[PDB]
Amino acid sequence: ERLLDELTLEGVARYMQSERCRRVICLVGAGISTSAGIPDFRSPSTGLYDNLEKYHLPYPEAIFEISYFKKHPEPFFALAKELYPGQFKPTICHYFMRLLKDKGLLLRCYTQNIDTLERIAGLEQEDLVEAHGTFYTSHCVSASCRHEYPLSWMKEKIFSEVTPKCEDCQSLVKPDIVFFGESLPARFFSCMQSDFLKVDLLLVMGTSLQVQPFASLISKAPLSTPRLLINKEKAGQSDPFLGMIMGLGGGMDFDSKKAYRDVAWLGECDQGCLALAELLGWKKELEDLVRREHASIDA
Amino acid sequence: HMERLLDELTLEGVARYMQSERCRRVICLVGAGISTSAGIPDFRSPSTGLYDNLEKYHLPYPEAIFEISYFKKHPEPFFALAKELYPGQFKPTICHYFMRLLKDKGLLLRCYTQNIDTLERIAGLEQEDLVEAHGTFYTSHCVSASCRHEYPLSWMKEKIFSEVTPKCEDCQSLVKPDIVFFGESLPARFFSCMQSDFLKVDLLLVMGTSLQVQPFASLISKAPLSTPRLLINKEKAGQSDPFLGMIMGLGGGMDFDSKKAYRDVAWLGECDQGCLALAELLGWKKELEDLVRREHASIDAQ
Ligand SMILES: Nc1ncnc2c1ncn2[C@@H]1O[C@H](COP(=O)(O)OP(=O)(O)OC[C@H]2O[C@H](O)[C@H](O)[C@@H]2O)[C@@H](O)[C@H]1O
Ligand SMILES: Nc1ncnc2c1ncn2[C@@H]1O[C@H](COP(=O)(O)OP(=O)(O)OC[C@H]2O[C@H](O)[C@H](O)[C@@H]2O)[C@@H](O)[C@H]1O
Ligand SMILES: NC(=O)[C@H]1CCCc2c1[nH]c1ccc(Cl)cc21
Ligand SMILES: NC(=O)[C@H]1CCCc2c1[nH]c1ccc(Cl)cc21
Ligand SMILES: NC(=O)[C@H]1CCCc2c1[nH]c1ccc(Cl)cc21
Ligand SMILES: NC(=O)[C@H]1CCCc2c1[nH]c1ccc(Cl)cc21
Ligand SMILES: [Zn+2]
Ligand SMILES: [Zn+2]
């Protein structure tokens, strides 16, 4: 069933202004924060996974892999000390999602990021699913213990160059950011079970959709729900190939003759959000919000 | 409405379903575990699997040897393994001949195989019965997309057993057999058969696979929600809690053991013995045994 009058940004904008479009879910990744100075993972040359050579890893992902971590925790904590102190401000894209909230359209933002820029831009707890966790809290990795530690305790250890250990059981303690091999937060599953039943539009921004189960989210919406991708490159579309991340047919179809609801706007997330905001008549409103908020942070 | 087709979640329940009028079309989903009893190692069995046995090639990770990007940078390890695996002949197993019985009883809609050993064909399945999902070593191709010149089996055998890394005659790019590496497209037949077959499948028989690679792993989720799915395998496969980096799409797995289980059965053991057990329940045990004896004797005839 086809709800967009045309498969373009303009078509998505007209749909957003129709009575049909009440509930919008944003699905976001590291691409929405590169313009703020935080590298992504998988972009050639600049991405984090192309810049870990000094840690002497078997493959880049090992630095956030739970089995490797337990055996060799030192690289992760060395990287954490290098990355933690960074100070960053939300992007136009983050403020666009804030505007969706204030306009009453945002059902939920599911984020793969741990930078907290969604919260800094003014989205609240109930608007967010921090799918790949948070550094705000930390836990002992032992399943029979799971002692919780606050951010202050973790910083005390990290910047003291002591490998954080649990005071009860001496097991490693790590921030609640989700590693390969680890469970996702309970909130991911409880929100996912209900949010996708009546969603009217998916807005996918700044992600390569290369990790499960987050990549499955696009297939959870009803088949009639349009999906707009704002990203530098097409993501989620391919023929069947061995080792593909998406389930069979769970991807996007922007370009086949059977394409009916997916739109790819290729370019920078910030510029896509500006372009869409203009089509919605919100451009002036977004720009002021950005300027005031960036000014407020500088103070 | 959820149609509960199995009267109990057991091999016995599955056999009763198979004998009913409701079970007309079976799809078999198979992997390397159906050929280990013939002498061919699997991939992911601890210690014995191929991926725990590649140390001498000093690969970055085991899957690199069957990965197209790595291959293009370092093709020698693949061909050095291909020398170690191209020789030797194998006979089909009881499990292969069980699939042959399904064919000859008009029950086999399709066998989707991740194997390149061709044992399904040697067991008497014909081309139309089969989706060789991960390719064939019978044909080869230049890796350059603009070229893609095809080369026959003899050409590839000539090059590999000359210990020369095969290059394309039209463009000098690497040539490899049409077995599917990580990063490579599956044959178009895979998708075309899947879209049709999975609309009309009455039972999935999943044997000898860990379901750890996509898109093959997705096939279980393409069956109608009521279609029972029987796993015959050493270990449970396709049933796990979600985690970051999981292979299956969310909700796309087997459910043998939860409070909501209604159609998935795991029979844990060797595929040959599981097929014998099932055949005995169906009244086919002697027929199967006779078939295996006959066909093996015939192969030994030359
Ligand atoms: N300014 C920009 N505008 C538009 N697109 C951009 C921009 N910057 C980057 N991109 C695109 O943005 C995308 C960034 O893709 P990836 O780097 O894979 O990050 P993820 O968040 O999806 O990684 C997911 C998980 O993987 C990790 O293991 C962690 O667990 C992560 O949480 C690319 O398509 C870029 O082209
Ligand atoms: N005799 C046996 N009986 C029953 N189960 C067995 C037996 N032998 C092994 N097993 C089980 O059989 C399963 C073997 O699983 P895997 O070794 O992953 O092989 P695949 O075919 O799924 O590999 C898929 C692709 O991955 C590669 O990259 C290639 O591309 C492959 O085509 C395990 O669960 C064993 O416990
Ligand atoms: N610095 C920040 O505002 C954020 C920015 C995103 C990356 C990041 C932050 N905090 C971290 C703590 C530990 C580890 Cl391993 C990574 C990070
Ligand atoms: N901008 C971000 O927050 C991205 C990029 C900074 C490192 C990071 C991000 N997402 C993550 C999810 C899990 C883990 Cl372990 C680390 C990260
Ligand atoms: N030997 C056989 O009948 C088959 C048996 C399965 C493994 C195998 C065969 N042929 C091959 C050609 C190349 C590579 Cl890399 C592997 C194989
Ligand atoms: N029994 C088999 O055919 C298995 C085990 C032998 C090597 C092998 C099998 N399946 C494959 C699929 C792709 C590639 Cl590149 C290699 C193989
Ligand atoms: Zn503890
Ligand atoms: Zn060529």
Numbering used by the authors:
A (entry chain B): 56 to 354
B (entry chain A): 54 to 355
Quote the original article.
Sirtuins constitute a family of NAD+-dependent enzymes that catalyse the cleavage of various acyl groups from the ∊-amino group of lysines.
The ADPR molecules of both structures assume a position that is almost identical to that observed in the Sirt2–ADPR complex. The carboxamide of both indole inhibitors binds in a similar fashion as the carboxamide moiety of the physiological inhibitor nicotinamide and hydrogen-bonds to the highly conserved residues Ile169 and Asp170 and, via one of the water molecules (W24 in Sirt2–ADPR–CHIC35 and W206 in Sirt2–ADPR–EX243), to Ala85, Ile93 and Pro94. The amide of the indole hydrogen-bonds to Gln167 and, via the other highly coordinated water (W3 in Sirt2–ADPR–CHIC35 and W203 in Sirt2–ADPR–EX243), to Asp168 and ADPR.
